[PDB]
């Protein structure tokens, strides 16, 4: 379905570092998602032709939100050209866990690990060069199928800085049946990849059962003004360059 953009009501906020703070208003300058921007909504309402998963331009960060609960997108393949000569990365939410398979994968003409297990060997074909295989803790990701009202707001930020492939996340039990809702909830860090690979593009590997819902943000070198509370968690923020009032704030 042709992407009908929507308004990201204060989404794409995440703890930028390891420091703890309390009741202080710190103004970080980092890659966030501009407030009230037009998110490149990949309308997965197919029950149209949302299998338009090209080599998407992986800019300096991507806000890969998803209001999906069956997790149709089990895999996320990354790379520059995806033609068997690149140290390509896969974040695969397989049966075991969120496995981080970055290797000298051998690709085919149409690069995608399609559901056939990701057995359509169009991304990975052999283990020749492999820097690190972060097989995370094996949790209850058993190819989920639950759907309905979008409880699990599967938000994710995938940035690549200094080689490090930082993957943030958050799971909020908020109920809605449509696009990104109002409210505020900052993301947490989930994994930091101590590798030095380069990524240029990526894909979204929907599970061949599609009717789903997954967005694609795009970040920018902005400056914010966070607001920490007593318990030390972000409760509010203002975009330092969005309006005159926000600027004077």
């Amino acid at each position: 379905l042709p992407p009908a953009y929507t308004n990201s009501f204060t989404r794409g906020v995440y703890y930028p570092d390891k420091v703890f703070r309390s009741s202080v208003l710190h103004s970080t300058q980092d890659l966030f998602l501009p407030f009230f921007s037009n998110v490149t909504w990949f309308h997965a309402i197919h029950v149209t032709k949302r299998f338009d998963n090209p080599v998407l331009p992986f800019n300096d960060g991507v806000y890969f939100a998803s209001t999906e609960k069956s997790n149709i997108i089990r895999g996320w393949i990354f790379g520059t050209t995806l033609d068997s000569k690149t140290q390509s990365l896969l974040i695969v939410n397989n049966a075991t866990n969120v496995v981080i398979k970055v290797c000298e994968f051998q690709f085919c003409n149409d690069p995608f690990l399609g559901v056939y297990m990701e057995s359509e060997f169009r991304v990975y074909s052999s283990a020749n060069n492999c820097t690190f295989e972060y097989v995370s803790q094996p949790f209850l990701m058993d190819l989920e199928g639950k759907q309905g009202n979008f409880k699990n707001l599967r938000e994710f930020v995938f940035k690549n800085i200094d080689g490090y492939f930082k993957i943030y996340s958050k799971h909020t039990p908020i109920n809605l049946v449509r696009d990104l809702p109002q409210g505020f909830s900052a993301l947490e860090p989930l994994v930091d990849l101590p590798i030095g690979i380069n990524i240029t593009r990526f894909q979204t590997l929907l599970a061949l059962h599609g009717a789903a819902a997954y967005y694609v943000g795009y970040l920018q070198p902005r400056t914010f003004l966070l607001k920490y509370n007593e318990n030390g968690t972000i409760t509010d923020a203002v975009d330092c360059a969005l309006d005159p009032l926000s600027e004077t704030k």
Binding site: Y15, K18, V19, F20, R21, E188, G232
Partner: protein
Amino acid sequence: CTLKSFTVEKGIYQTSNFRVQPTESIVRFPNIKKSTNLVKNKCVNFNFNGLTGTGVLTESNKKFLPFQQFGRDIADTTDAVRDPQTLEILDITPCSFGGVSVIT
């Protein structure tokens, strides 16, 4: 000596400064580097995860989020640090305590 004179008039003159001297020097984070035990309420020379400093590692009352290492205040200086081994939080309070003035 600070007045450069052999006769001082009645008054209160500030002569020196006074800083408590740190006693020990601990090194942490061989949790999984050399190890040393936790000492409290005494000015020491701590080295937590590369972060080197001085202070009295008192007991903490604030709760960190379970991915955070450091902690700080409005003045942007280290105030609480996560114990690398036992995974606890410890405050910091430097002990550079005031000048020293002579009354004559």
